[PDB]
């Protein structure tokens, strides 16, 4: 029993964290084999942020201009290149602690673990979600650029996020590991802001199934609804449209609890229209939406790796 | 910016997790140097749980009766002993990944990270607190016995919890690393239940300071109260008494935000008497109490290790 915001074990990733210094700027880098990945704005200067030309800034740099420290060892840079908004520094040494890994670009609504770092040293690990508006509600301070987000699917680390910026509202924006930003954001000083967000409906439903698995049943009812009548109520409460694909993904959780997906949707409509009335669900007074169906199965069945 | 339930990086602990098998029972063990620690009820049989005599059960066991698997390597047991409710199996090999470590027995209200494991393999990491009633609200399934809780204070791992049981209400109970249970619980089948719990007041106040640090100010007021008048309101809402020591611990957070502790207490009294009125604090509609003052400073200042 129990349900927590559970992050993946971080050790496989900790062994890859390094420190990259260019001039006065210092941030974190990801050391995989003999390449170090980090945000390309480590090359910028604070006075040249309105519109930096990254190709020009990079041709004027040399291999000795990058200080890469891995713990108590300095790494020698033997080459550099740029891929979208990430900088790739080839080093003369391959990381012996390199895990089995992939680079994945995830969809909004999926979750990952963040290993926040400062000066190459891991500080903490937490779970978060890619919001529908392609921001993340992380916990980041100055120096955390280059921290990565990741998932694990057996022994393979799937990296999916590298941290680049904090927007004015305090949320965060960054790229996949091939340097493509999530959302319409760019690594330059503009008036860009996070758009309006919505609630990840399929995730709320999974978290409701997680509650049933753990003994919370006060919110269920005898009713059922259609996909159309539910999406009409969802859109009124700023919820993501629920697709038939979502209903299919919620299949295994529906069979484990014997509650049909459209039956669970009727409970959700009631909860949106009437609130919780002083009651809580899995220790929350709000409808949580940062648990994917896979997260629920992972925690309520107990898969390792 | 941002505030998350942040766990410590788990890698130092992952390298110590093993699998211990005695007869048909299998649970997790903690491999530090040449000793493997695990719950002593791994020696029991399912039919002899009403009142097992652990001294008798242990004299009838031999070194070959314990199977200790560390990954894809079997460890040879060269001795066994019992310390309170933990079993200590000396192995012929010292763990090369043994970190710098201590064993600490923590106070109710303190937090730690849990690395949940099954069959020796880490599954996930989450934060939790020792409740005033000496239970923890963890996330544990069959096979998670032997998972440990821990803190990090530089490069030293301070182990403080080993998981033993899940009580009827779904909360969990276990021991420190020297085998002494937290609370009045015992590793035998009785009618024991978790006592009535209270809210960790000093932790709520720290989490309120964390909110101010992150831009949430709607709950502040101009008022102040005394320690006595506040504790009179706290006891009415089933909150832990606030001591002068607590007020001293909240010192640095009070100086960073310029809000006096007794001023923050006046905000808390108002929030208890009137609720939140549809508003949230740091993304919660409830008053969170699983953040210690040190956790807040760690996340809002960014210490690593
Ligand atoms: C000084 C050379 C260029 C400059 N490089 C950094 O400044 C920087 C350096 C090292 C670690 C860093 N760690 C962080 C950081 C991470 N997460 C949360 C935070 C919260 C508060 C303060 C800082 C952070 N930054 C800052 C750059 C990023 C930003 O959004 N600028 C508008 C935040 C770091 C930069 C300016 C503007 C941008 C823009 F694209 F947003 F405009 C990007 C980079
Ligand atoms: C079979 C030999 C003895 C027996 N040994 C185990 O049974 C056991 C074995 C391996 C991994 C285990 N992992 C778990 C487990 C951990 N966390 C959450 C869980 C949630 C649901 C189910 C199981 C768990 N257990 C169970 C023993 C503990 C308990 O409270 N019994 C009343 C839970 C494990 C045992 C019975 C009673 C007690 C008592 F002291 F509570 F009475 C203790 C142990």
Residue numbers in the entry:
A (entry chain B), B (entry chain B): 1 to 305
Direct quotes from the study:
The SARS-CoV-2 main protease (Mpro) is a cysteine protease that induces scission at 11 sites within polyproteins ppla and pplab, and its inhibition blocks the liberation and maturation of proteins required for viral propagation. The active site of Mpro contains four subsites (S1’, S1, S2, S3) that accommodate the amino acids of the peptide substrate (P1’, P1, P2, and P3). An affinity selection of a 4-billion-membered DNA-encoded chemical library (DECL) using Mpro as bait produces novel non-covalent and non-peptide-based small molecule inhibitors of Mpro with low nanomolar Ki values.
In contrast, it was discovered that CDD-1733, harboring the S-configuration, gave a Ki of 12 nM. The structure shows CDD-1733 within the active site where enzyme binding is driven by direct and water-mediated hydrogen bonds and the hydrophobic effect. Hydrophobic effects lead to contacts between the isoquinoline unit and other S1 residues including Phe140, Leu141, and Asn142. The six-membered ring of the hydrophobic benzimidazole extends into the S1’ subsite, where it makes contact with Thr25 and Leu27. The tri-fluorophenyl occupies the deep hydrophobic S2 subsite on the enzyme.
